[PDB]
Amino acid sequence: AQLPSPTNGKKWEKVEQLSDEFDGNSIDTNKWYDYHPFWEGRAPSNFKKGDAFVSDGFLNLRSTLRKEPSSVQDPFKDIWVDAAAAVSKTKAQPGYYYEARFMASSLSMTSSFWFRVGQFSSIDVIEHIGDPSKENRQDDLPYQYHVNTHYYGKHAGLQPLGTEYKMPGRGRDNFYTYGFWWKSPNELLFYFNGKQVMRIVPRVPLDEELRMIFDTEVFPFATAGVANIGLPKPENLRDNSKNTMKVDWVRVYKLVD
Numbered sequence: 001a002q003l004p005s006p007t008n009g010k011k012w013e014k015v016e017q018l019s020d021e022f023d024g025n026s027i028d029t030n031k032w033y034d035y036h037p038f039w040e041g042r043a044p045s046n047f048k049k050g051d052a053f054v055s056d057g058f059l060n061l062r063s064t065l066r067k068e069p070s071s072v073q074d075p076f077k078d079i080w081v082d083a084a085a086a087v088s089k090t091k092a093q094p095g096y097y098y099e100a101r102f103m104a105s106s107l108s109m110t111s112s113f114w115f116r117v118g119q120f121s122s123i124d125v126i127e128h129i130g131d132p133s134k135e136n137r138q139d140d141l142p143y144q145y146h147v148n149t150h151y152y153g154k155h156a157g158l159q160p161l162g163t164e165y166k167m168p169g170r171g172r173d174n175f176y177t178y179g180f181w182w183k184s185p186n187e188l189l190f191y192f193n194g195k196q197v198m199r200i201v202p203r204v205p206l207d208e209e210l211r212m213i214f215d216t217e218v219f220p221f222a223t224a225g226v227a228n229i230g231l232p233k234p235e236n237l238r239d240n241s242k243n244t245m246k247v248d249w250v251r252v253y254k255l256v257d
């Protein structure tokens, strides 16, 4: 995919420790955790180590059935979904350009690309609901590229600030390239297949380093930027043709000279 024009005659140079074509036999443990070392996941899902795995040219983030949801006390709370997460060992920094090309899962769970593990901020480039089980959301969520920022810690109290773009085709049917220029602490620019589509001026400067993350989550009710999407279906979690978010690659660049 094409990168923004570089500011002032600078050139883009790849940040190797945050970029990966995922074309090997297994995940590069110098660069990635294949689980989330800082968070267990969003009940009734928790991340299972290795449900994020490299194979067939992709970082694959698969969500599988841990327990029958009719077997646990409350399927909105008790853990019965094994979700996937990969988290960067190197920190993401203000100023860089980030882009991931991926096809969402076909589950009522997120396929997400975002930044956190900070002290006061998060940046969600996309939290895509490939196939919401609440069926009145099928004409909308599968086309949505929804970006968001969150504020906590010293800035708890501030509401999220986000926006969205309606894609021409469903996230679960396409590899699309979602791009994000952390251009300033006060200016985030978002790209869809190389075209600038969204802009957020964050409520306070996003000037702290964050880790970069791909994951999948169940949302048991509307919360932290996310609608009422429905719980996923065991028959889809069991199906490897539907249960996997596939990231063909992630590339990150900084301006040099």
Ligand SMILES: O=S(=O)(O)OC[C@@H]1O[C@H](O[C@H]2[C@@H](O)[C@@H](CO)O[C@@H](O[C@H]3[C@@H](O)[C@H](O)[C@H](O[C@@H]4[C@@H](O)[C@@H](O)O[C@H](CO)[C@@H]4O)O[C@H]3COS(=O)(=O)O)[C@@H]2O)[C@@H](O)[C@H](O)[C@@H]1O
Residues within 6 Å of the ligand: 038, 039, 040, 041, 042, 110, 112, 114, 115, 116, 117, 118, 122, 123, 124, 127, 150, 213, 217, 224, 225
């Ligand atoms: O043992 S604990 O139960 O965990 O208690 C100790 C506490 O740790 C705190 O911080 C975490 C806990 O509150 C934890 C419990 O599950 O939740 C962590 O936050 C995760 C979410 O709750 C939070 O909503 C969020 O999720 C992101 C959304 O905001 C957003 O950005 O989109 C993405 C992708 O969809 C996520 O859904 O952040 C999560 C953690 O992500 S991480 O990458 O930063 O790890 C809390 O951080 C300490 O604050 C607390 O004082 C307690 O000790």
Ligand SMILES: [Ca+2]
Residues within 6 Å of the ligand: 021, 022, 023, 057, 058, 247, 248, 249
């Ligand atoms: Ca690849």
Ligand SMILES: [Cl-]
Residues within 6 Å of the ligand: 025, 026, 027, 034, 052, 053, 054, 055
């Ligand atoms: Cl792997």
Ligand SMILES: [Cl-]
Residues within 6 Å of the ligand: 106, 107, 108, 109, 131, 133, 231, 232, 233, 236, 237
């Ligand atoms: Cl599902």
Ligand SMILES: [Mg+2]
Residues within 6 Å of the ligand: 027, 034, 050, 051, 052, 053, 054
């Ligand atoms: Mg793995």
